[PDB]
Write a protein that holds these residues in place. Structure first.
Motif, PDB file in Angstrom:
ATOM      1  N   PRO E   5       0.948  -1.255   0.300  1.00  0.00           N
ATOM      2  CA  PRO E   5       0.462   0.299   0.046  1.00  0.00           C
ATOM      3  C   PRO E   5       0.718   1.226   0.093  1.00  0.00           C
ATOM      4  O   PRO E   5       0.046   2.624  -0.670  1.00  0.00           O
ATOM      5  CB  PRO E   5      -0.720   0.453   1.312  1.00  0.00           C
ATOM      6  N   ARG E   6       1.732   1.126   0.389  1.00  0.00           N
ATOM      7  CA  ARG E   6       2.240   2.510   0.648  1.00  0.00           C
ATOM      8  C   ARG E   6       3.001   2.959  -0.256  1.00  0.00           C
ATOM      9  O   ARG E   6       3.333   4.272  -0.869  1.00  0.00           O
ATOM     10  CB  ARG E   6       4.167   2.557   1.974  1.00  0.00           C
ATOM     11  N   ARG E   8       1.217   2.775  -3.557  1.00  0.00           N
ATOM     12  CA  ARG E   8       0.509   2.966  -4.063  1.00  0.00           C
ATOM     13  C   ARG E   8       0.219   4.672  -3.469  1.00  0.00           C
ATOM     14  O   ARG E   8      -0.177   5.746  -4.144  1.00  0.00           O
ATOM     15  CB  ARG E   8      -1.133   2.511  -3.801  1.00  0.00           C
ATOM     16  N   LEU E   9       0.548   4.828  -2.030  1.00  0.00           N
ATOM     17  CA  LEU E   9       0.092   6.046  -1.089  1.00  0.00           C
ATOM     18  C   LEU E   9       1.366   7.131  -2.141  1.00  0.00           C
ATOM     19  O   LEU E   9       0.532   7.956  -2.097  1.00  0.00           O
ATOM     20  CB  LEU E   9       0.998   6.065   0.318  1.00  0.00           C
ATOM     21  N   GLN E  12       0.000   8.540  -5.050  1.00  0.00           N
ATOM     22  CA  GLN E  12      -1.114   8.794  -5.122  1.00  0.00           C
ATOM     23  C   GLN E  12      -0.257  10.914  -4.683  1.00  0.00           C
ATOM     24  O   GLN E  12      -1.207  11.631  -4.878  1.00  0.00           O
ATOM     25  CB  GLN E  12      -2.624   9.076  -4.471  1.00  0.00           C
ATOM     26  N   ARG E  15       0.321  12.141  -7.421  1.00  0.00           N
ATOM     27  CA  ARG E  15      -0.899  12.438  -8.910  1.00  0.00           C
ATOM     28  C   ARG E  15      -0.899  13.663  -8.485  1.00  0.00           C
ATOM     29  O   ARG E  15      -1.950  15.180  -9.164  1.00  0.00           O
ATOM     30  CB  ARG E  15      -1.537  11.721  -8.481  1.00  0.00           C
TER      31      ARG E  15
END
Lengths: 102, 203, 563, 180, 16
Positions: E5-6, E8-9, E12, E15
């Motif tokens: 998950p890290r 992905r964070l 984002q 982004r």
């Protein structure tokens, strides 16, 4: 309540302005729902804390072919028992096609 | 900041939002982060060829829990906005004038305005167009949260002192000390600022 | 194909790998219910979606297959499918059938299908089944098609091959005619699933209790012999008993909150511990035959018998729960020694709640499954499921439902069956009709009970021995029984039969041929209005008008086998 | 806020289990890594994950240290002697009910543990009832102190909040009726 | 590669 629709017995009691108000409110709510995340969120799902992943259900009518989110086909027909993921068939439980089996 | 920290902050926000009688400052940032995390985990599980194993079930149950928390938070805030939409817009504008943090996000504000218009149309078509010209203004009730109580627990070390109304002499007020493990039955408006700052957990 | 070993690799993993949709097709009976209860627990541990369909006739299976030609399924058939060729039913071309069935013998086409069909068998059962070798029954008859002297030689060789084909066909018809000689029941299905779950280490006291109830149902329904039941208990069930015993009694006698199972001696009376002992005795087969209580002297005979045994009338006529424990143990010892049988069974205990018997729970589940026929099949299935779940909990409402089930329909069924036998003997309804005896009613006492296999088998087996006890020389013929229906089935009869008393079984298997006799009556010309939809071959429905021609045709079959 | 949501929050606590399955990598939950699993070697995971494994027969649950009978007797002694509410472990009643519901095979001295928990609940309930009744006779203040109250105990007692809101209106009416 | 998950964070965060 149930799925997002008015019964005919309720609609026969209304005036036209109230029917217009229902349509305006439903359109506004769907437009708000579309902006959550990428794909939108259905807020009639997850109405209570989740107890388990799968549910045991009895089918009340010949709905026909149905498919889960993993791509497994299920043949919902009258008086049959199924074990399905909760998120996939919560909508059919609300709409009265399935009932929970205890 | 880790997602493990974001989820822990979100849970405390959800509990305070359920307990409070009125609208707290918005926290849609954490909601957006957790929704993106749900989508990323879903696509990652979708790339797997084997699904009848323990890991996938554990991951899917965690996604179930996070989806419940975010959905219940958004439902509670929408149900609060629907009770009195004009007052919510008024409070948001007053916080902006005071230079404080936002009460409503952009989508929440857009929803509030559109719901207010949709609610105005029904009254105008049913009653208000038939009134005499003086009586054609739209009524908007004042706020109603004046005498509400809460159960509140203190978590921060250095909260200090709080003032409450004096029921022996309602011209004046009484001062209380908040030692850093205590639980109290107290009016909400005394602890409003500390609930915004995160020094108090409502129960 | 027959699977005799390695069931986890051959059967379960192929379902776990999740390529096709999983459907269970279940016969509505107690053993099939217990088998389903074990199997769905195993699937739900691994998070496999599935679905269940309940059937009670071959035509329902035909409709399910006929509507599903476009699908792709793992079908699992429970206590049905073995005894008729499945390929002549429209199996969908992409799907697979697994069969778990206790009926015997397997249909030879189902044995030698190429691989769309898999049949599960008991350990070492192939040594006893004695299936014919393949080339004696199946042949590539497609290959029979085929200078002046070469033309003559081809004519000679064609004559030779046609004659040898006819020789082979004579041998084949003899072999098949002996293969389809009889029908019988093998071991109950749920024992195999208990053995399978023990490999996966997902066995608990609930699954053990369900297996015990399913095993006792086959004994109560007169499907297997007492010798075969004893052999199954000694061989296959004994390794699991010590696991779940209440050995926490060694830990300071402590009554914990868990289900505990024991095994031991038992009285073969039907419902004695939930009733009074006098009423329990007066409807049993053993004491009714011994005292002849359909006659006038029965009350005097049973009073003298109780005086000889040393039991007071007040003890027999108060409720059995009211007696003190030592008095109960003394009375049970006396009556066990009097009946002189080797019966033993399983008992389940939970907390400070009352002890239950697997045989009694089996009777309650059977009578909630099979009656009344005016209710829908899924409702009867769900009722049996609820009764079976009520036995493993201490909750007040659930135990109250179970006790109401004991004290109404289980008593009433025994009383109606006894009344049927007593009226038959006292009004001389049973007559000789050549090579068999015939029984017929003016009216049936309760038509909701007539269509139940439990009622029919128990009543007819009681009736033939009661009739044969009155006079010597009655042991050498079978009995045929007919019951009428009214209302929505007015003008129809239900017909069944029982083997002669004097028959000797070469082993414990209890083979019968009367269903085969009924089936061969159906083939005669001009046809008769017979309905043959049930999974059991020795129960049929017959039009009332064709009774005389049916009697003559059945006499022709029994005489032609006497010749 | 209700009892189901109280149990939902109580599910986030950590508890120790002994697996019978084994696995090589960790499991990267959004709430943090929990693995790897080795058979016969204990490790700590969330309570919801522990109950999920226990239903699938994949582990054995180890009860908390405060479920020892001696520790429960100490808690009962302190609760009997103190005038106010004594301090308890976090989510005490919720974790007790969840473990008795789903994992009572692994609890040791189950009936004694159950009876002691029921005793503690009974007298804490009586203390809260007496405190609320004595508060509702008040007119001079609108404040009380309720140290060491649990979340489910607070959730069951929300009638007092409504009663105090109703009392405040009549008090304000008397103050506005006082002449000048 | 093993999902986390890290990452992905962090993506984002880039982004938004």
């Amino acid at each position: 309540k149930y799925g997002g629709a008015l019964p005919a017995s309720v609609r026969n009691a209304l005036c036209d302005a109230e029917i217009q108000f229902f349509n305006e409110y439903s359109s506004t709510l769907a437009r708000f729902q579309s902006n959550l995340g990428e794909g939108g969120v259905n807020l009639l799902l997850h109405s209570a804390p989740p107890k388990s992943l799968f549910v045991q259900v009895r089918a009340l009518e010949d709905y026909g072919e149905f498919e889960t989110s993993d791509g497994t086909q299920v043949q919902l027909s009258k008086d049959s028992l199924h074990s399905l993921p909760r998120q996939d068939c919560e909508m059919l439980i609300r709409q009265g096609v399935l009932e929970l089996v205890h | 900041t880790t997602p493990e920290e974001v989820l822990r902050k979100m849970t405390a926000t959800w509990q305070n939002e359920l307990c409070a009688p009125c609208l707290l400052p918005t926290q849609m940032e954490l909601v957006e982060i957790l929704l993106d995390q749900i989508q990323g985990m879903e696509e990652n599980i979708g790339k797997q060829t084997d699904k009848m194993q323990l890991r996938i079930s554990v991951h899917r149950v965690e996604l179930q829990r996070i989806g419940f928390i975010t959905s219940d938070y958004v439902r509670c805030r929408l149900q609060k906005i629907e009770s009195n939409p004009h007052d919510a817009i008024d409070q948001h504008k007053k916080r902006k004038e005071e230079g404080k943090s936002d009460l409503l996000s952009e989508s929440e504000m857009k929803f509030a305005e559109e719901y207010a218009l949709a609610e105005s149309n029904l009254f105008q078509k049913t009653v208000l167009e038939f009134m005499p010209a003086a009586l054609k203004k739209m009524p908007v009730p004042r706020g109603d949260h004046d005498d509400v109580m809460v159960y509140a627990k203190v978590t921060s070390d250095d909260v200090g002192n709080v003032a409450i109304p004096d029921w022996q002499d309602l011209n004046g007020e009484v001062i209380l000390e908040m030692e850093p493990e205590s639980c109290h039955l107290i009016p909400f408006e005394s602890v409003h600022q500390l609930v915004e700052d995160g020094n108090i957990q409502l129960m | 194909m027959i699977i005799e070993d390695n069931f986890r690799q051959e059967f379960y993993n192929k379902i776990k790998k999740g390529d096709k949709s999983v459907v269970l097709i279940v016969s509505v009976d107690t053993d099939a219910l217990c088998t389903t209860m074990i199997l769905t627990h195993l699937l739900r541990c691994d998070d496999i979606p599935f679905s269940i369909l309940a059937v009670e006739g071959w035509s329902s299976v035909e409709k399910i297959f006929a509507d599903s030609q476009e699908q792709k399924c793992h079908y699992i058939l429970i206590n049905c499918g073995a005894t008729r060729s499945l390929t002549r039913l429209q199996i969908p071309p992409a799907s697979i059938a697994f069969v778990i069935d206790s009926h015997r013998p397997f249909h030879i086409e189902n044995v030698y299908e190429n691989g769309q069909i898999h049949l599960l068998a008991n350990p070492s059962e192939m040594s006893e089944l004695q299936i014919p070798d393949l080339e004696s029954v199946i042949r590539e008859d497609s290959d029979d098609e085929e200078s002046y002297e070469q033309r003559m030689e081809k004519i000679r060789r064609k004559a030779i091959k046609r004659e040898e084909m006819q020789i082979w066909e004579r041998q084949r018809r003899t072999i098949l005619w002996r293969y389809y000689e009889s029908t019988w029941f093998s071991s109950p299905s749920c024992v195999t699933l208990l053995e399978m779950a023990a490999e996966m280490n997902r066995v608990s006291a609930e699954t053990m209790w369900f297996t015990a109830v399913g095993l006792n149902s086959a004994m109560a329904d007169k499907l297997i012999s007492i010798e075969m039941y004893t052999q199954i208990c000694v061989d296959r069930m004994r390794p699991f008993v010590h696991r779940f015993m209440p050995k926490n009694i060694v830990n300071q006698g402590k009554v914990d909150d868990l289900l505990h199972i024991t095994f031991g001696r038992e009285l073969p009376l039907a419902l004695y511990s939930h009733w009074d002992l006098f009423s329990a005795m007066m409807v049993s087969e053993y004491f009714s035959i011994k005292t002849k209580n359909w006659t006038q002297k029965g009350d005097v005979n049973i009073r003298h018998l109780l005086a000889q045994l040393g039991i007071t009338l007040h003890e027999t006529k108060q409720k059995f729960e009211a007696l003190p424990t030592e008095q109960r143990n003394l009375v049970v010892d006396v009556l066990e020694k009097e009946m002189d049988s080797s019966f033993a069974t399983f008992f389940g205990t939970l907390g400070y709640c009352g002890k239950l018997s697997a045989c009694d729970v089996a009777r309650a589940v059977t009578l909630r499954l099979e009656m009344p026929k005016s209710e829908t099949i899924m409702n009867r299935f769900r009722s049996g499921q609820s009764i079976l779940r009520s036995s493993i909990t201490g909750e007040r409402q659930d135990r109250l439902n179970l006790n109401n089930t004991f004290t109404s329909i289980c008593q009433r069924t025994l009383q109606v069956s006894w009344k049927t036998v007593a009226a038959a003997i006292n009004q001389s309804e049973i007559i000789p009709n050549g090579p068999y005896y015939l029984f017929s009613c003016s009216r049936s006492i309760d038509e909701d009970m007539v269509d139940s296999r439990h009622f029919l088998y128990n009543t007819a087996g009681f009736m033939i021995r009661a009739f044969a006890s009155m006079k010597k020389g009655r042991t050498t013929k079978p009995l045929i029984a007919m019951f009428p229906l009214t209302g929505e089935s007015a003008g129809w009869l239900v017909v069944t039969g029982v083997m002669p008393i004097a028959t000797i079984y070469e082993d414990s298997l209890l083979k019968t041929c009367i269903g085969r006799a009924f089936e061969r009556v159906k083939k005669m010309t001009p046809p008769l209005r017979i309905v043959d939809d049930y999974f059991n071959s020795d129960i049929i429905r017959l039009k009332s008008e064709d009774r005389t021609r049916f009697i003559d045709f059945l006499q022709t079959v029994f005489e032609g086998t006497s010749n | 806020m209700n009892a189901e949501r109280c149990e939902f929050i109580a599910g986030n606590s950590l508890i120790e289990v002994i697996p019978s399955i084994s696995d090589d990598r960790p499991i990267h939950l959004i709430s943090g890594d929990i693995g790897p699993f080795e058979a016969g070697v204990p490790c700590r995971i969330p309570v919801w994950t522990a109950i999920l494994m226990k239903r699938k027969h994949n582990c054995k649950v180890v009860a908390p240290q405060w479920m020892d009978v001696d520790e429960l007797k100490k808690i009962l002694t302190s609760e009997t002697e103190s005038q106010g509410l004594a301090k308890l472990p976090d989510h005490f009643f919720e974790i007790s009910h969840m473990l008795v519901r789903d994992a009572r095979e692994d609890i040791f001295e189950v009936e004694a543990v159950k009876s002691l928990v029921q005793d503690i609940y009974d007298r804490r309930d009586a203390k809260l009832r007496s405190s609320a009744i004595e508060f509702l006779r008040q007119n001079q203040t609108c404040h009380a102190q309720l140290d060491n109250v649990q979340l489910i105990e607070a959730s069951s007692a929300r009638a007092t909040l409504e009663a105090c809101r109703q009392m405040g209106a009549v008090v304000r009416n008397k103050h506005e009726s006082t002449p000048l | 590669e093993h999902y986390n998950p890290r990452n992905r964070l962090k993506t984002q965060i880039k982004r938004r």
